[model samples]
Target: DTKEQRILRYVQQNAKPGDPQSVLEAIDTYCTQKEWAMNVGDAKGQIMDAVIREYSPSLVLELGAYCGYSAVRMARLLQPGARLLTMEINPDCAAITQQMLNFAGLQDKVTILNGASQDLIPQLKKKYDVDTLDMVFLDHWKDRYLPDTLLLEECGLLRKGTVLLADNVIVPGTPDFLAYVRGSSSFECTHYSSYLEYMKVVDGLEKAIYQGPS
Candidate 1:
């Protein structure tokens, strides 16, 4: 089966109905043992780590937390008092991601909030005393990329120097988001053009890193 088919099959066979955490676990296992997922790969993860170090953000916000893979990656680089708040729309995925975090002993470093990124952003601001986010990772539904980023800005979540990393910029391309950033003078972007996961297929899967106005 192809990559998309593999994901569908894995979700259908391994995921417990109404159990998002279980689904996340199944996906994690599949990626680790079977095929390399299109998530932040090892090389891409190194770039993420470098960004983390450069920003030294006290609080990080993630728009999507699929299987907690990227959360785990960020947790490893966070400063002592730093934390990551990841939002997911699917409740099942949220539970599974939380479970995965616990399994990996990263429960303390990350918090998975279940709801739309826009809805939870305000709540997070009130609950965590979060005035501004230093970094953001976007890997959720591609269609919401531009709107979500705009929402974040409107809600005062993004700071001037915030670093934003968007995955699957080429495969599931975010045309509006890309265009907006490219046209703006406030952001600098770096695109990592890479082959699709699992094989050197021609499927366009690229990663984009954006550093906000300096």
Candidate 2:
């Protein structure tokens, strides 16, 4: 079994159903103790949660679902009635994510879309009637970061005050994304220095707030 599959097995056996926190903790512990998985470790997740709490967004988009760790974390922090849509291009990852979310009792709060961001983002606008997203989490391919951000802009999914939180901006680094968000007149960007998931090496997250059309 893959790491994702192992995580599913671990959670099913160890985590209590309907307990989001326990499931999250189980995932974290497994990642730290057994293998280092890239699901935005607890340290950075706290920062992400703080941002979510600050905004209290009604509609959130996660560009990468990975193992559904961050998705569960975000769902737990989201205001009641709020919904989070997460996209994972990998079918196996998506399947595991769905199961993980279900185990956490967040099946209703999160919708897992198994497809590329470019293909699914446009549909999200129509499917959710999403005029503008309140917040977005970017954690997918480092190379696609800039393109996806531009796509979201082109699709009119980002509005004034919409916040974009990007992980792995430092470790693997998203230079193009960082540059665009920092230079673009429509966005105000800031970096929060931290460590890579499950490691004590240098990494960080970028928080960019859309300031409307330039």
Candidate 3:
């Protein structure tokens, strides 16, 4: 089995059903003890939790659904009736994520979509009948960040006050994305210093609040 498959199996065997926290802790322990995986480790995850709690967004979209760790983290804290839709380009990851979310009893809180962001973004807007997203978490390819942000703007999915949180902005780095959001008049951006998932290497997350169209 692949590493993700192993994670799914490990969680199923170790984590308590319907307990998101336990599931998360199990994943963290597994990563720390055995294999290193990118699931937005506890350190940065706290930042995400604080932002989500502050916003209490009713509609959220995530660009990547890697292992469904962040999805479970955000979904569990969402306000009542809030929903998070996560898109993953990898079929295996998407399937594994679905299982993970299900195991955590977050199947209703999150919807996993398997496809490219470019194709699924429009579909998500239409399916949800939402013109604007309250929050968007970007954790997909570093190269696609700028274009996807532009796409979200073009589709009118990002309205005034929408929160955009992006990961891995320092370790791997997304210079273009950082520059665009930081320089744009339509966004108020801040970078939080953090470490890479499961490692003490340098990394960071970019938090940007949309200021609406200029």
Candidate 4:
């Protein structure tokens, strides 16, 4: 009846994560030749790059690894020893992302965990000895944003001074998460309001940076 089913199917289909170039090309083909879809796209990806560089995080985490575009970008910005743990709920997407990361020559720099954001965090904490995640990019299910962030906080994964970059905040909107951050004294939030990549209208994204207790 509504656009929900179509949107869900589209998201599922393009969720394949793999070599950045191939994944991007595949998605491009899907959008241009198949149907409309949403990936971070290249414009927003560049903005993500800037955030990564500014944070200079030693350990990065992403809630979504669709096609590994963002993962590739993060890997390039990180130091040699630094690594990123990206999670995907779709197994097919995770497989693609792993291959993409490897193709990007970032085998050692990125690990693609095939599971939901919340489920994968615990394993990441245990397996990677990740007490505090330095940076996080939220790009998965929009509804999971605040809850996932809270889960990470409860698990002691996201400490003070952790940099959190949330995409499509205004477009899809994370009102609950937005409200929580706006009222919190712990976070210094900046809005990167810009037109959505290849779109004409403005979309606001929140790039919240928290400070650690001294």
Badly placed stretches (over 4 Å) of model 1 are 1-29, 36-39, 199-214
Please give each candidate's TM-score.
0.77, 0.96, 0.96, 0.81
Best by TM-score: 2
lDDT of 4 by residue, 1-214 (tens): 2232332244345645434454445445555444343656566766887888887999998888766667777787798698888889977677766666665567788877887777777777678778799998988898998898778777777788899899989887898888877667766789887676355567777887765432
Better lDDT candidate (3, 4) = 3
For model 2, residues 1-214, the per-residue Cα lDDT tens digits are 7898998899999999999999999998898888675667888988998999999999999988878999999999988899999999999999999999999999999888889999998887688677789999999999989999999998999999999999999888899999999998999988898866456588999999999888
Candidate 1 lDDT? 0.69
Residues 149-186, candidate 1: write the lDDT tens digits. Answer: 77877777776677787767776577888887766765
Put down candidate 3 lDDT per residue, 1-214, tens digits, no spaces: 7788888889999999999999999988888788575667899889999899999999999998877888889999998899998999999999999999999998998888889999988776677677789999999999989999999998889889999999889878899999999998999998899866456587899999999995
Query: How far out, in Å, is residue 21 in model 2?
Result: 1.0
lDDT for 86 (candidate 1): 92
| lDDT agreement with native, every candidate | 0.69, 0.90, 0.89, 0.73
lDDT of 4: 0.73
| Error of model 3, residue 55, in angstroms | 0.8
Models sorted by lDDT, best on top: 2, 3, 4, 1
